[PDB]
Amino acid sequence: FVRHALITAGTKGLGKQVTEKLLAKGYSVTVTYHTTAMETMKETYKDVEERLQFVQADVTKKEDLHKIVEEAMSHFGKIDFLINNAGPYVFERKKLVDYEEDEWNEMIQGNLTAVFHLLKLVVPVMRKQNFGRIINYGFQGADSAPGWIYRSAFAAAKVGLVSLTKTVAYEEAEYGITANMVCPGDIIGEMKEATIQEARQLIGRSGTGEDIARTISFLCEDDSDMITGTIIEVTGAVDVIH
Amino acid sequence: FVRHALITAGTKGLGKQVTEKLLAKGYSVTVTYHSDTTAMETMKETYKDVEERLQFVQADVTKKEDLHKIVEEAMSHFGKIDFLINNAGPYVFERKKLVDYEEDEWNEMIQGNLTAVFHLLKLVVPVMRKQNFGRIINYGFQGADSAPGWIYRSAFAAAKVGLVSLTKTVAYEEAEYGITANMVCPGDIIGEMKEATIQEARQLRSGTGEDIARTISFLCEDDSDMITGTIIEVTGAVDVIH
């Protein structure tokens, strides 16, 4: 009766701090990656190895998603928390009309359809448990369905994800399952993998992966069962999409 | 020197009234039809007198190849695309939770309502830039602008809510070129009312295709160039999604 989390892309960026947060809480974790970074994580947590499982996976591929669920279930028997931390991002700034079909598809499959696929696998398990926490990621300002100049596909996929988070919240509330979204603001470079303490050492201090990690950790608690369908902005009042 | 429109699925339902409106305003139209040859046949004969202004093209608008064909055929006969009216869009009539969706169902919704638009924009927007004139019309649903959940409609809500954001993004990206992009949200106009006129509703008030069509033709007007990125609801204050 130790709760189990499944987190996509949890060895780098924001997802690394999320993983470290849940382990620190006593949770067991399945972490996906898409390899030297994973190996250093595995080594850092040598002494708690039974509570940490690594699986290689491309979240745009249905089969790989089926396999991370199968491997989590095989070793742990349960999935209590699904953190859809993985979010393929086209860093290039260009207009929708200039998008390659490969880029469009990567955004949609990577950010919206990957979540559908996962849910299709994980919701039934959560129903059997009468417990589930789904955490999706948005971007700042997401709940207002905004356009994002030069981020067409990403924004479209994530805004669509907003709708989906909400629908899943209403459809699965019956079964002890909550679905929420966290929106990180502009957390840049080294600060993605950094702690609050570190940012505070140097508007104000930079936002960090820990800021996200502590918000996700709060939504995953047993007594957060009434918080569902909500979008938590963790941006420190710093505008991104404008 | 007269304005040409491209309307997907323009011989049935809402599209029928939209096509009838634009023809009545003096516009030329390329209309697409999937399967129903009978529909396009009775619109053929109705408009024999204005044969020169009207053109039927068979197309499955979920197929990239067919999307290229309609654009190539409109450009062939009329040399321009002034208005793009994305009237087509698959709809799953069965009410079912997302966790019950077959992969094929999910993909039809995304591909038909979101990705197909991207594919059309990709073809038609370059032509509009050249023209220094464009009117893009997309369809949503009541309340879409707030990115809501919609129980039993997860895939459709998600795809149209992503389309809300896409519509606004395209509006920001293409404003320099004299191109507007807007969304019309029909209410739950059921059945024969979709191709009825307002006068026909007043004799029987219900919403109709005309209510939608006259909104679209207001937006396609030349002096409507400052209206862009807006989601106009034509519902009559009547909740659909709760």
Add this chain to the structure above:
Amino acid sequence: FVRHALITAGTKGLGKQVTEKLLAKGYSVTVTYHTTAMETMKETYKDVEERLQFVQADVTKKEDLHKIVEEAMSHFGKIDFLINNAGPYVFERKKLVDYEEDEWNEMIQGNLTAVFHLLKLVVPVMRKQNFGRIINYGFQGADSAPGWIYRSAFAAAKVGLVSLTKTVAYEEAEYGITANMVCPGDIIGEMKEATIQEARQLRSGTGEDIARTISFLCEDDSDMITGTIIEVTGAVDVIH
């Protein structure tokens, strides 16, 4: 049986173009002001005096609001369109906590409570008519209930007004009354009173852009359009 519009602050700014629009459409109009702009307008439409009436009013004063309704009804016997074009605005950029109590109250009273007062008078008239068009103004992005740095009070009252336009659309639908909001972007200076043609020769949004949206919402066959917010910003961010 010619339709009648009541427009607040319709002698200058955006309101001016809206008045001129409805007049051109063949309508009759009661315009408020809170003076030489009224006289120049009064001079321009000497020919059609019968269709244009001017009433002085402070929109933040409930007594004046009752007076405009009375005067319109005495003269015309009906109110078909209500266009709440007036909207005091604090042009200074100060943080919320720097507001004087009088500044706060002007924004709330001027932008939210004024509309309630007017609706309270005009709605019964519209129900009896089985017809009404209520038009409110917001600002760009208002539909998302956004904050607005240095425009706290204005934004709060205008965002509240969004809620109000929607509630009134639902509550009054059964009487042939629609309520809709128009949100203009940054129309600055002369462009507020400008025509679309003029702008094309100098494009900045104009008062006529707002006017033609309002005119379309006011048509007999726009009965199905209600509780909507229509942005006429031309894809220019204002509030960020």
Add this chain to the structure above:
Amino acid sequence: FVRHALITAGTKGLGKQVTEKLLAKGYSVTVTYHSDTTAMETMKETYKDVEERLQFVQADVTKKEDLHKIVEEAMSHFGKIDFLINNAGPYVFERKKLVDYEEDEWNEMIQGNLTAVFHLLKLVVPVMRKQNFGRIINYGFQGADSAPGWIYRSAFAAAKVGLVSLTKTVAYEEAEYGITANMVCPGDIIGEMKEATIQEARQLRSGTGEDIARTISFLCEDDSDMITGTIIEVTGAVDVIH
């Protein structure tokens, strides 16, 4: 060096649970009460052993003079105001259309839900600035974030939706000073369940004051400083406003 909270209407309903939570978290609290004196005497009995961290002040929150009184009383005893929990909220229980509103009913809704907050912020924000620390908590209703209409609740909806905006504005203007401002939206929590613990509700699930209380609790934390301008729904995926 214990953090001080000021909470309007904190001896009854949701307010009571929030008050009990903050006490359990080690904080001192100034709680305001309007009419009922028996309720505040009973709470004052319950917490005899922590009298020093609990101050009661009589106040009508719709009166500017009483607002100065509570801030003044708080500063006198504690020398600081760390959290402002605007729990009070006048509510017209009678379900009527806007046109049937008395000039006086409208005015109480605005004055009590919106202007009252402004007056308090006018008094408390400058204290927070000097401390370089602040947590502002306002209340909304389910779905307030999308500025909806609410039939038969027009004045309350309008005042609460205006408050949404005010909250975000305060958040952007005051981030420099380490002040955050957030909204919590309770769903329909009924009667006794307002003063109930989550624990009580399980042994009966219904939402409680404790569900709201623990959210505020989380938002007041020192490490919650990157969460600002966010509207958190603690509904339970139960729609009320339709």
